[PDB]
Design a protein around this ligand. Structure first.
Ligand SMILES: NC(=O)c1ccc[n+]([C@@H]2O[C@H](COP(=O)([O-])OP(=O)(O)OC[C@H]3O[C@@H](n4cnc5c(N)ncnc54)[C@H](OP(=O)(O)O)[C@@H]3O)[C@@H](O)[C@H]2O)c1
Ligand SMILES: NC(=O)c1ccc[n+]([C@@H]2O[C@H](COP(=O)([O-])OP(=O)(O)OC[C@H]3O[C@@H](n4cnc5c(N)ncnc54)[C@H](OP(=O)(O)O)[C@@H]3O)[C@@H](O)[C@H]2O)c1
Lengths: 424, 418
C-alpha cells in the first residue's frame, strides 16, 4: 500500500505524520533533510537511540506517542531505489526546489508523492519538475491537518500538537486515485476527516493559510511587528492594536476569497463557502455567535453581511469558547500566539520567518498563475505590494548587505510551467 | 441667579455638585435627605462638625439639613435633585410647593425621556419653577465609607453632557452650564429638555446588553462566575443578537424623540465621541459620521466592531508582549440580601428596567409599539419572576415585584399636550 515511506523534511509536520504512518504500518520509514544544524542535531539524536515523540496538548493528550525512524539521510547521495512513497513535509514554498533536488535516477520505484500543505497550482508545479516518464502520482492535501511545533530545537525529534482540524481535503493527479483512501485512513488515526475530491486543484482551493495568512499577515500591522527588533511583537490573531485583525483586513479576506474562487472556477474546481469552511472544518463557535443559517447561507449573503460574519468569527475566537471557565468566568486565551520576528542567521544576515515569507511566495505564484487565466486579482496584488513595500523599507533601513537574499523574486517562470503543465 | 440652593438627596452626586456650586458662587447650601440610616449618620456627622468633603478636591459647609420635606422654609431659589431618577416623581409630589413660591429652578441631574414633563405634571397650577434636565451625571463619584458619610471620591469626569430647560429663554441654563464646567465637563445646552433627555448612554446600552438572557442569568445567580459586563459571549453578554437589539432599540427611541420634538442622535458617533473612542483603523471617522445613514447591516457591524475594539483599552500603554489593559473586565454585580435579609437587585439593571418601562408606556401615547423595547422588558420580567418563584416572594424586596408605569406615562402625555 504505502510500501516504504520517505519523509522529505523532518520538522514539526513530519513528526506528526510519522506517528500516523507508524500507527498505519508504513513498512520502512525513512527521512531526508538537507544539511544544517537541525540535520546535525537529528543525526546525533538518532545515533543516541532517540525516537520521534509526539505529545498532544490538553484535549489532544490522547494523540501522544512514539515512532521509530529506520533511516535518516542528510545527503541524497546515499539514497537508493528503496522507496514507494514520498511525503513532502518541507515548507510549501520550497516544493519546487526540493523536487528538483531529489535524485530521481535512484527513485524509479516511487509510486506516490504527497504534498502535505498544497496551494493552487502546487500539484502541477511539482509535476512540471518531475523527470520525463516519471509515473509517480502526485497528491495534494488541502492543508496540514493540525497545529504542531518542535518545542525545543535542541530536542529536534519531539513535537507538540496543540490543535487538530476537523476536516481536510485530498486530491490526486491520477483520476479516481486509490491512494486517497490510504491517506484518509492514515489521517483518521488522529481524528481528522479527509474528504477526497476529484482534482488536485479542488483540494488546493481549500488551503486555509492562503485565505487567512494572506489578508492578515501581509498587511501593515503584521509587517510592522515582524520587521521590528525592539517593540512588542504583538499577537497574530488579536484585534488591533494588539494584533492585525481590523475591518479592513476582513474586507481584504472577503475580496481575496472572491478572486481565488473565480480562479478556481477557471481551473475547473468548485470554490468553497469561506465561513462554513472556517467554522466547520477548522474550528467552530457557538450558534449564539454564528447561527447555522448564517454559516450555510454565507455565499449568498451579500458583501456587508459576509464581512460582518467573518469579523464576528475571529472576535468570537479571541478566547476559546469551549474551554472551561475559571472562577471569574474567563476562558482560555488562545489568540495569544506571538508574532515571530526577523532574526539573524549564522551568517549574520536578517531572515524573515515563514509567516510572512512563505505566505508571500505562495500568493505571488498564485497571482502570476491567474494572469494566464486573464484574472487580474487586484486585492491579492495589493497585499503583495504591501509586503514588497514593507520589506523594501526594512532593507533600506538595515542595509542590503545585512539581509538574506530571500528578502529580495520573479514568479512568472514557475507560473508558466504550471500553465503549460495544465494545458498538456 | 443661584441664590440659596437645596440639594435633595445628599449622596455622592450631591457632594460633587456642592463643591462645583461653591466654586462658582451661591448663597446658603441646604440638603434634604429622607429618613433612613444614611440620614442618621449625616445628622451625627454634622453634629460633630463635619462638612462636605470632595477628593479628586475641597470642602464645603452645609448650612441646613432636613429629613422631612414639610419642614422646609420658603428660603430656596434652586433645588437640585440628586436622588435616583426613579424617585423624582415621589420627591416632587412630597414637597410643599404651595409654600415654596420662592423656588425658581429645579435641576434634574440624571433625567430620562419625559422626566422634565413628569416633574412638571406634579407641580401646582401657577407654580413658576423652571425645570432643567441634565442628560446624565457628569462624573464618577462614590462615598468611600459610610462612617465618614459626607466624604466622596470623584474618580473621573465626563467629556460632555447636555442640558435642556422647560423655559425657552432661560437664564438658569447658562448659569448651570458654567457651574458644571468647573469640573472640566463641557455642558452643551439644547433647545428642549427632551433633546437632553435623549442623550443618556445607559438608555441605549444598558437596555439591550443587561436586560437580555445572559446578563440576567449572571445577575440573578448566587454562585458561579459573575461574568463580565462588556465582553463577548461566553465571557459576557455581547453577541450579534444583542447588537441587533441595540440597533432596533435606537431606532425606536429615535422615533419617539422625533414625535416629542427632539432631534435624535447618531448612536455610533455618540458612543465614540461622548463615551470612549477607538482608532481610525477600527472605526474610520467617515463611518462614524455616516452611521445614521448606513443601513441596518452596516450599522450592526459597526456597533459590534466598536465593542470588540474596546475589549482592551487601545489607548493604554502596552506591556512587553504588546497586551493592552483589559478594561472590559467589569464584573456583574449580582443580587444580594439587604439589612432585612431580603433579596435586592443591583441598580444595573433595576434602574434600567424602570426607565425603559416608563419609556414604552409613554411611547404608546404617541402611537409607537416599540416591539424591541417590549421584548427586553419581557426578558427581564420573565427572569425576575422565576427568581421570585425560586426564592419566595417573602424573601424578595418589593422592588422586584411588578410595576405599572402607565399612570406616570399618562401624566407626561397630558403635560406634553398642555
Ligand atoms: N507546523 C504547523 O502547525 C503548520 C501549520 C500550518 C501549515 N504548515 C505548513 O507545513 C509546512 C512545514 O511546516 P513545519 O512546521 O513542519 O516546518 P519546520 O518545522 O520548520 O521543518 C520543515 C523541515 O523542512 C526543512 N526545510 C526548511 N526549508 C527547506 C528548504 N528550502 N529546502 C529543504 N528543506 C527545508 C527543515 O530543516 P531546516 O530547518 O534545517 O531547514 C525542516 O526539517 C509549513 O511550511 C507550512 O507550509 C505547518
Ligand atoms: N454616583 C455616580 O458616580 C453616578 C454615576 C452615574 C449615574 N448616577 C446616578 O445619579 C444619581 C445619584 O447617584 P448617587 O451615587 O449620589 O446615589 P447615592 O449615593 O445613593 O445618594 C442618593 C442620596 O439620596 C437619598 N435618597 C434616596 N431617595 C431619596 C428621596 N426620595 N428623597 C430624599 N433623599 C433620597 C439617599 O438616602 P438613602 O440612601 O437613605 O436612600 C442618598 O443619600 C443616581 O440616580 C445614580 O444612578 C450616579
Amino acid at each position: 500500500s504505502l510500501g516504504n515511506v520517505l519523509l522529505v523534511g523532518l520538522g514539526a509536520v513530519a513528526i506528526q505524520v510519522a506517528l500516523d504512518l507508524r500507527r498505519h504500518g508504513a513498512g520502512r520509514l525513512g527521512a531526508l533533510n538537507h544539511p544544517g544544524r537541525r540535520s546535525q542535531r537529528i543525526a546525533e539524536a538518532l545515533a543516541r537511540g532517540a525516537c520521534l515523540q509526539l505529545e498532544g496538548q490538553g484535549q489532544h493528550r490522547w494523540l501522544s506517542g512514539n515512532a521509530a525512524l529506520d533511516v535518516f539521510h542528510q545527503d541524497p547521495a546515499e539514497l537508493r531505489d528503496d522507496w514507494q512513497t514520498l511525503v513532502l513535509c518541507v515548507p510549501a514554498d520550497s516544493y519546487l526546489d526540493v523536487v528538483r533536488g531529489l535524485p530521481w535516477e535512484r527513485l524509479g520505484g516511487v509510486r506516490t508523492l504527497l504534498l502535505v500543505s498544497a496551494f493552487i497550482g502546487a500539484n502541477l508545479l511539482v509535476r512540471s519538475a518531475l523527470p520525463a516518464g516519471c509515473q509517480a502520482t502526485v497528491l495534494s492535501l488541502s492543508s496540514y491537518y493540525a497545529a504542531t511545533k518542535v518545542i525545543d530545537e535542541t530536542q529536534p525529534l519531539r513535537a507538540l500538537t496543540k490543535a487538530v482540524k476537523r476536516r481536510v481535503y485530498l486530491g490526486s493527479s491520477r483520476p479516481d486515485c486509490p491512494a486517497r483512501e490510504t491517506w484518509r485512513r492514515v489521517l483518521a488515526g488522529s481524528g481528522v476527516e479527509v474528504v477526497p475530491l476529484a482534482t488536485p486543484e479542488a483540494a488546493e482551493g481549500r488551503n486555509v493559510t492562503t485565505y487567512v495568512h494572506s489578508p492578515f499577515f501581509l498587511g501593515e500591522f503584521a509587517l510592522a511587528r515582524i520587521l521590528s527588533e525592539q517593540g512588542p511583537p504583538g499577537f497574530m490573531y488579536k484585534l488591533y492594536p494588539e494584533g492585525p485583525i481590523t475591518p479592513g483586513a476582513i474586507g481584504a479576506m472577503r475580496r481575496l476569497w472572491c478572486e481565488l474562487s473565480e480562479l478556481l472556477r477557471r481551473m475547473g474546481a468548485e470554490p468553497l463557502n469561506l465561513l462554513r469552511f472556517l467554522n466547520d472544518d477548522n474550528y467552530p463557535v457557538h450558534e449564539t455567535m454564528l447561527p447555522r443559517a448564517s454559516i450555510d447561507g454565507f455565499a449568498e449573503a451579500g458583501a456587508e453581511r459576509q464581512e460582518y460574519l467573518l469579523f464576528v468569527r475571529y472576535a468570537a475566537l479571541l478566547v476559546d469558547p469551549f474551554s472551561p471557565a475559571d472562577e471569574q468566568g474567563r476562558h482560555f486565551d488562545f489568540s495569544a500566539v506571538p508574532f515571530r520576528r526577523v532574526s539573524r542567521d549564522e551568517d549574520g544576515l536578517w531572515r524573515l520567518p515563514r509567516v510572512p515569507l512563505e505566505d508571500y511566495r505562495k500568493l505571488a505564484l498564485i497571482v502570476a498563475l491567474a494572469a494566464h487565466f486573464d484574472l487580474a486579482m487586484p486585492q491579492a496584488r495589493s497585499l503583495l505590494a504591501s509586503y514588497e513595500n514593507a520589506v523594501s523599507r526594512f532593507i533600506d533601513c538595515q542595509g542590503a548587505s545585512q539581509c538574506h537574499p530571500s528578502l529580495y523574486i520573479d514568479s512568472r517562470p514557475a507560473a508558466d510551467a504550471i500553465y503549460r503543465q495544465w494545458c498538456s
